[PDB]
């Protein structure tokens, strides 16, 4: 039982390389979330501000500039 | 030594399920990205579209407030 004992000894040594070989891809592609999506969340916030101010800027640009303008052009009266 | 293969049979078996179990999580994380990679394609457009015809109203609304604002200078002064 020399060749049988030795066989299992070299047998395990490859599957323990797969143990790293399959946690190698896992460690890498898991980092493909921690930065790629996390910053991808930020650009939404960055683009989010412009929908806050175009409403604020047009808040004065639509109401005030028409509460008095069309009042001023009441020359028909 | 006679039983030493019996102990080394289980590492030849246990390392097999660590191969079996781990690849399952590799199966899941792929669609945990791909399906999301279809979600962050629609969100940008559905968010950017609701801006791409907001400047077309921030301007054309001022067209009435500039093409008709040239008339007030005729009488105010």
């Amino acid at each position: 039982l020399a060749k049988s004992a030795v066989a299992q000894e070299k047998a395990l040594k490859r599957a323990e390389e797969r143990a790293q070989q399959l946690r190698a891809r896992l460690d890498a592609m898991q980092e493909a979330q921690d930065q790629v999506r996390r910053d991808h969340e930020a650009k939404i916030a960055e683009l989010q501000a412009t929908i806050e101010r175009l409403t604020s800027e047009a808040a004065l640009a639509e109401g005030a500039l028409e509460a008095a303008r069309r009042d001023r052009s009441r020359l028909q009266m | 030594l006679a039983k030493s293969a019996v102990a080394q049979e289980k590492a030849l078996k246990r390392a097999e399920e660590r191969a079996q179990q781990l690849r399952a999580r590799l199966d899941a994380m792929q669609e945990a990205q791909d399906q999301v990679r279809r979600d962050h394609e629609a969100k940008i457009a559905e968010l950017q579209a609701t801006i791409e015809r907001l400047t077309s109203e921030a301007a054309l609304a001022e067209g009435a407030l500039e093409a008709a604002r040239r008339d007030r200078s005729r009488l105010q002064m």
Epitope: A49, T50, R53, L54 | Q48, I51, E52, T55
Partner: nanobody, 99 residues
């Protein structure tokens, strides 16, 4: 009649959501004239439909406008505009005159 305009920036390059262009009548108020955005969509103020063509370079950060076939009544005081992180930012300001 040959004329051109440009408005460059040296910092925060391409970190640009909606940014726009203005003109000022002397001693009068201020209003938009032309705009460009993230996707480069085309739209203007009604006064220049068929009059202005506006285009971007993402890298160099200097948007351009096409001014041709001018009419002496278009003269005003121009000052490019940009909004970063939701806050607006004006510059020095210039004029364009034809007469």
């Amino acid at each position: 009649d040959s004329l051109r305009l440009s408005c460059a920036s040296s910092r925060s390059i391409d970190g640009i959501n909606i940014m726009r262009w203005y003109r000022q009548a002397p001693g009068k108020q201020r209003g938009m004239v032309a705009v460009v955005t993230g996707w480069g969509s085309t739209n203007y103020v009604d006064s220049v439909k068929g009059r202005f063509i506006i285009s971007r370079d993402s890298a160099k950060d200097t948007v351009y406008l096409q001014m041709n076939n001018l009419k002496p009544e278009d003269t005003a005081v121009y000052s490019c505009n940009a909004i970063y992180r939701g806050s607006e930012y004006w510059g020095q300001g210039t004029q364009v005159t034809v007469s």
